């Protein structure tokens with residue numbers, strides 16, 4: 084059972100601009116996703132302070148990076164708070180808590196898209212490098228769900244029949260054919276060192292066999 088949704092107009096416009104831009108500094112997508120993971124880890128850590136049982140679904144707070152040359156995918160996995168079905172639809176489908184309109188105004192005025200995270204929409208920088216993004220998520224209070232979009236104005240959500248996660252979020256970037264450099268461990272390592280060295284949660288790069 085698959086449900087289809089439309090992006091809010093402003094989000095569709097943002098995705099269109101990102102998807103199509105010749106913006107060369109594409110490596111920033113990774114720090115944005117890592118930053119989101121860190122934020123979600125902050126969220127579960129915070130809740131756990133007053134309700135320890137929230138970590139029954141897993142005590143480890145970490146971020147894993149998983150390149151897959153065979154599938155041409157780069158996966159970012161965290162054990163953060165995850166998202167309920169409602170959270171998932173709202174966070175990805177709407178302006179939600181972000182400064183999306185101010186960002187679009189700033190872009191029109193010639194701002195650098197590296198500022199995207201400052202406007203609370205860093206996730207969409209994934210489309211600099213990905214033709215399709217899948218987001219699998221598990222929150223303590225809901226089932227495991229899979230969100231996906233290849234842009235073009237719509238996304239889908241379905242209950243995930245994949246491998247169960249205890250709790251957290253997995254972002255699967257289905258890379259553009261010209262963007263396979265982000266499957267190279269040496270490339271990933273350097274991007275993490277440049278832009279994510281002061282994230283306090285452990286970030287582990289899984290080197291391909």
Ligand SMILES: CC(C)c1cc(-c2n[nH]c(=O)n2-c2ccc3c(ccn3C)c2)c(O)cc1O
Nearest residue numbers: 116119120122123163164165166174206252254
């Ligand atoms: C949005 C992307 C897909 C994403 C989300 C979560 C997630 N799991 N539980 C959460 O609350 N978040 C989260 C974190 C940050 C966010 C939002 C919304 C706006 N910002 C800035 C949501 C994640 O762990 C990794 C990710 O890449």
